[PDB]
Amino acid sequence: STGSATTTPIDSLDDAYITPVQIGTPAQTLNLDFDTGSSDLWVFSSETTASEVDGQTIYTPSKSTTAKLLSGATWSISYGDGSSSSGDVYTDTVSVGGLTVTGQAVESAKKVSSSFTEDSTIDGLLGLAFSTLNTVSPTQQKTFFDNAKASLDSPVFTADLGYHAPGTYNFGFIDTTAYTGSITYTAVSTKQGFWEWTSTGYAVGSGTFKSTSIDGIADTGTTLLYLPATVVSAYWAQVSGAKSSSSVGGYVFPCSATLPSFTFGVGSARIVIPGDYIDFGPISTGSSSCFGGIQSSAGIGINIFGDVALKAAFVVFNGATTPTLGFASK
């Protein structure tokens, strides 16, 4: 089997991407944030505290002939941006782009933090990290990908995120028309539950490539690219007027500045992030000061190849017995 679904930016900055997911019988379509940095599929629902629901589409398990309550099960998650959600657990039929999993754990939110409430466009998350990070208790549940794996033509999914445009999540096959050149594959560590890998270095604009190991995770659920402070300083030093602002919370630059590209290494291959991708617009409405798309990971505890990086590539998440990541230009 395979599946193919279009993923769409939630706003003009590519702050996140949403993908329609069919849940239950008859289908209830919710727009979920596919997150390769977490492992819970959770949704706004008929059970979510009413005051915490503001425009999202909710899952109503009582209207689904295939929903089943997982007795006694609870879940609770906290994300790196400090947002959180929690509730109880159903299993139901879940389809993504034509690919159907029966008995998928669908985590129903009883509570969500304000950032979720305030974001009307995201109806929940669908985690695609390794199932070891799933927060369901007393018994951890498997991700959509993990449940689908054995059925897939090939045990893979691919992320083809768009720059200010829609893109594609495919399951079970590699679309050889979706990228230029070849895919370079690189080893993954699952020790922390993430798609963790080691980049082979970076370049700033037309500068020479610096060979250096950068451990990090491929995370579709993070907006920006977070790298060591040394690397990030090297980049912004090449932008006239750029500075790190503690009040704003990161590197900012004159909106009229021309940004250099940023290259990261995948083995002996190179992915180039165009300068434009690194502009996340005014720090506040009407400002001539803009927020940078490359920021320091210092304080996060991990480097994160988020959407700014991933959208410059066609990315293969290879869930074979020994997992790997593949990157191609496109």
UniProtKB/Swiss-Prot annotation:
EC number(s) stated in the UniProt entry for this protein: 3.4.23.22
A GO molecular function held by the record: aspartic-type endopeptidase activity
Coiled-coil segments: none
Keywords for this protein: Aspartyl protease, Disulfide bond, Hydrolase, Protease, Signal, Zymogen
Domain of life: Eukaryota
Active-site residues (renumbered): D35, S199
SS bond partners: C255-C290
Catalytic function, reaction form: Hydrolysis of proteins with specificity similar to that of pepsin A, prefers hydrophobic residues at P1 and P1', but does not cleave 14-Ala-|-Leu-15 in the B chain of insulin or Z-Glu-Tyr. Clots milk
Name of the protein: Endothiapepsin
